[PDB]
Design a protein around this ligand. Structure first.
Ligand code: ZN
Ligand code: ZN
Lengths: 172, 172
């Protein structure tokens, strides 16, 4: 995959004004990330969760369903953020399954990549890898797969950098 | 309950700086509400969900658990917002259980209060009643109940008014 800086006036999830976007962000990020969204507040329907993840739970299924069925949303953005405390390091005792399982799988699946980086760069790669895995897994849901096959849904990944105050799209 | 305007310089969930607060807000609200929180961004750990509800699922349990166990959070705020589409009299077909069941139960449990009220007033009451019920329910979570018994947790309710850019605490 590659990282492309967003231009706020041409974002892939706002090819036209006045539509709502489901924005999946992290609980230890904050409102600064939406300043990099290219979206006005009235176009943001935000689900803010542990590690900007969607897992196999009632909350994630009902939120996606409301967005697709009630709001007729055609764009989802999964926004990770550098410096995340959840998508970081090797372990966190207070983080339950399946959130902890998803991170453990990224750490094992990408052990070669992660081992070639040190500390801070390693956490940054985990944030990017989590965004890519969340986007891929959300496309593989029965409800998203049907919508994608009709060309009525796009799912996008980006990472917000609080140091540059910029978002970066994951192209891959 | 009664409604009390917030004083930004003396909020119940910030009797001291530099602690994190778990902020439970609604997906169809937005970042404007945190301008009325009395909290700087660095002190906000935000779960943003359908109807600012916590339902009995893995996401509620894990989010609360992480906040109590990993972040050692001593304050929770449930923030409703006037104009909410979810906590309203409009019953949308695409809202799943148990969110739809919580609202059904509010409408029946508070039928006396609600039945004397026209649309706009009824919807503002339903926003306030949802916040109160969410605060009451969350104190009966086993993890919250243990912390309250040690005087190591407070759960607070408020409602944000986008029109006036003001918050109101629910005083029980
Ligand atoms: Zn995070
Ligand atoms: Zn709402």
């Amino acid at each position: 995959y590659q990282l492309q800086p967003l231009s706020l006036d041409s974002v892939p999830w706002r090819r036209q004004p006045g539509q709502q976007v489901l924005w999946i962000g992290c609980s230890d990020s904050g409102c600064d990330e939406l300043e990099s969204s290219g979206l006005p507040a009235d176009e943001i329907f935000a689900y803010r969760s542990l590690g900007n993840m969607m897992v196999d739970d009632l909350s994630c299924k009902a939120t996606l369903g409301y967005a697709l069925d009630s709001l007729k949303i055609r764009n989802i953005v999964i926004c990770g953020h550098y410096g995340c405390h959840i998508a970081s390091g090797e372990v966190n005792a207070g983080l339950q399954k399946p959130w902890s399982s998803v991170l453990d799988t990224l750490r094992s699946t990408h052990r070669r990549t992660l081992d070639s980086l040190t500390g801070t760069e390693r956490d940054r790669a985990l944030v990017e890898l989590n965004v890519l895995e969340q986007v891929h897994s959300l496309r593989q849901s029965a409800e998203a797969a049907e919508a994608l096959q009709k060309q009525q849904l796009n799912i996008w990944g980006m990472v917000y950098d609080k140091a540059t105050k910029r978002g970066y799209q994951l192209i891959e």
